Design a protein around this ligand. Structure first.
Ligand SMILES: NC(=O)C1=CN([C@@H]2O[C@H](COP(=O)(O)OP(=O)(O)OC[C@H]3O[C@@H](n4cnc5c(N)ncnc54)[C@H](OP(=O)(O)O)[C@@H]3O)[C@@H](O)[C@H]2O)C=CC1
Ligand SMILES: NC(=O)C1=CN([C@@H]2O[C@H](COP(=O)(O)OP(=O)(O)OC[C@H]3O[C@@H](n4cnc5c(N)ncnc54)[C@H](OP(=O)(O)O)[C@@H]3O)[C@@H](O)[C@H]2O)C=CC1
Ligand SMILES: [Mg+2]
Ligand SMILES: [Mg+2]
Ligand SMILES: [Mg+2]
Ligand SMILES: [Mg+2]
Lengths: 359, 359
């Protein structure tokens, strides 16, 4: 087996992250007036209107860039875009018409739909246009997705590390979700610059460098891990043991979910894990130092196995097969309903309702 | 084996938490004018000045209640109290002098020190005084702690389910950390009223009923689990596998910690797990739905181990031994230092410095 060329500083500004210098761009490198000048002849055609099309699109619109939306006419996204103020015929079109109008084509359809639609959209990404992704899913797993970007266009990526809903809300607050950028194909000598400028234009906080392959392996891993799948499994397991030993729902929920999200996890994020430890009792410190190695070892096998499911392509197959179905929306909502109806989340609805700021 | 008596509704106001009625009190039940009248002849002597002494004491002081601090003279607590505006000889004294002046003795020493000082403090908690804890640790594990509260005083508990730093900061926003309340001994018929009034007076959000035994068991189990020990272990294991497969630190940290605390975990806390899932991509939802039952299954044995270590007394014994040492501050700090110097947390420093709100 073969190794991989490292990410290259190229003499650019860098930050030392715990022993590795990484390429990093910050908002002051791309102020609003500069972005407007840089893109003054461009049209961002944003294809798709999931939460990334929402957060990236509305941030581009607010920053004054010439952005339009392309989605299946009279589908769900179409109406969702209308209710965010995109006007059919002005800056909301069907997919083919948006691509004809745009110079930068932001493929923000579902990863499954990126594969399904690609035979039809590829002839429209002509010379002089730029093809943009927010995930390496489609072009990297070509054996399963059949997505081959044309060799005569720049192919760039900007990947916000957060929910599209928080890409929007943080930007409104003066904050911002971090983004990866990557170049998959550079034909002009400007793909990188466009990827970094795009990354700032969509409201990112800081931008750091990756590759399409690194990004898709990280992303697929994390969302299945602690970002979404792990944290939920953790909550479910801890809550169940408490309920089986007699603890009332309110007690078990406050000791599992509420204390975490309303107190301790925000301290981790504001000041780091040691600060959060030091903000709790000597008892909880002794207890937490005792048991985090036991939790690390219980989960490490699960994590190296999940990374394998990502690398070999199983998780990609799963998503292509489930989300590639026309009724994917209806059956995903079925499984979300199962989450909704678990005791722990029925209890959560009541706990949240009692918060002083919801009264 | 022996069973236990359930919690008693007693025909009080109740809230249904997923099929269980629970005694819940709200701030509206104790308006500020009521509180200040109810406690007008009392003195809260608050013993200790960790996070809870800081959070509860300053909330009582700002609320207008007659609170004083009692801590070892010229130690760390004493220094911090003086910085927080407590005045020696006015509302800041040593432990014995404070107890002598108080009518409600809030024992907020470390759970190891509660056991160490208890033979000297017990004779000072005389008839007409009230003993108060924020943790069932001492009286419930009497065979290990040797804490036996006097039979002629009320003994009560209000346990804020969050760090004392958050008890303080939420109070200053008109929010609040929720509290358990419980009664160990009631010789007046007024112990419950007092525990609930204290829970509200120290700044709690809503107050639900528990017992001393139920509180300490769920509490010790919670902090060792996903509250502090469990979330740390998950972070370390997920981050290590990523670093073991070549991902840069900024990528591995963002895909593990930053996106979690800055984006997705706040969504869980504000609207529940299903809302968070629906705010993410169709690929993320497919993966999270495929893996949360796997993480639950891999973790639940660790949690049945944890609850048994809490139940039988190993955890309490562990904390009594380690924290009861005189140099507990520097011994605990040393272990906190290993955390600070972990690659993941050194990286997090630079990640946090790059946030736009921190410029
Ligand atoms: N968020 C939290 O902190 C929570 C804690 N609780 C409970 O609240 C109580 C207080 O916890 P917390 O505020 O964290 O306190 P800590 O665990 O941080 O204990 C620190 C306090 O203990 C004193 N102390 C320690 N050893 C001794 C000793 N040998 N003799 C005399 N005093 C001593 C310290 O004085 P010095 O500076 O001189 O060492 C200081 O006032 C505990 O029952 C805890 O379980 C409840 C909910 C959560
Ligand atoms: N927070 C996030 O969502 C993040 C996601 N990304 C990446 O951004 C991209 C978009 O994700 P996200 O915004 O969540 O979108 P979703 O995964 O929710 O996809 C929804 C969009 O796909 C369209 N679509 C679905 N099926 C089809 C189909 N058969 N034909 C045409 N259009 C279809 C929908 O239109 P319709 O209503 O008509 O079905 C809608 O516009 C992905 O590459 C994702 O991995 C990047 C960072 C994080
Ligand atoms: Mg991600
Ligand atoms: Mg607690
Ligand atoms: Mg505790
Ligand atoms: Mg993804």
């Amino acid at each position: 087996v073969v190794s991989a060329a490292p990410l290259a500083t190229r003499g650019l500004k860098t930050i030392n992250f715990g022993g590795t210098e990484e390429v990093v761009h910050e908002r002051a490198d791309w102020p609003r007036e500069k972005l407007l000048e840089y893109f003054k002849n461009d049209t961002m055609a944003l294809i798709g209107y999931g939460s990334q099309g929402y957060g990236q699109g509305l941030n581009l619109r607010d920053n004054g860039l010439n952005v339009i939306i392309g989605v299946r006419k009279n589908g769900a996204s179409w109406k969702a875009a209308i209710e965010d103020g995109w006007v059919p015929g002005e800056n909301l079109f069907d997919v083919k018409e948006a691509i004809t109008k745009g110079t930068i084509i932001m493929n923000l359809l579902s990863d499954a739909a990126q594969s399904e639609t690609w035979p039809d959209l590829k002839p429209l990404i002509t010379e002089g246009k730029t093809l943009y992704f927010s995930h390496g899913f489609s072009p990297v797993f070509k054996d399963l997705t059949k997505v081959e970007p044309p060799s005569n266009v720049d192919v760039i990526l900007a990947a916000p590390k957060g929910s599209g809903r928080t890409v929007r809300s943080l930007f409104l607050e003066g904050r911002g979700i971090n983004s990866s950028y990557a170049v998959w194909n550079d034909v002009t000598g400007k793909a990188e610059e466009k990827a970094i400028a795009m990354a700032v234009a969509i409201g990112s906080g800081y931008v750091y460098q990756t590759t399409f392959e690194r990004e898709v392996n990280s992303d697929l891993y994390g969302e299945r891990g602690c970002l979404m799948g792990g944290i939920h499994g953790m909550f479910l397991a801890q809550y169940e043991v408490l309920r089986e030993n007699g603890h009332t729902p309110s007690e078990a929920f406050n000791e599992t979910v509420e204390e975490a999200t309303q107190s301790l996890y925000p301290l981790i994020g504001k000041y780091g894990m040691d600060y959060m430890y030091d903000a709790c009792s000597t008892t909880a410190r002794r207890g937490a130092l005792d048991w985090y190695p036991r939790f690390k070892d219980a989960l490490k096998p699960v994590f190296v196995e999940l990374y394998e499911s990502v690398k070999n392509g199983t998780e990609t197959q799963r998503s292509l097969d489930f989300n590639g179905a026309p009724d994917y929306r209806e059956r995903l909502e079925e499984e979300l309903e199962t989450i909704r109806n678990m005791e722990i989340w029925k209890v959560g609805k009541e706990v949240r309702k009692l918060r002083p700021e919801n009264q």
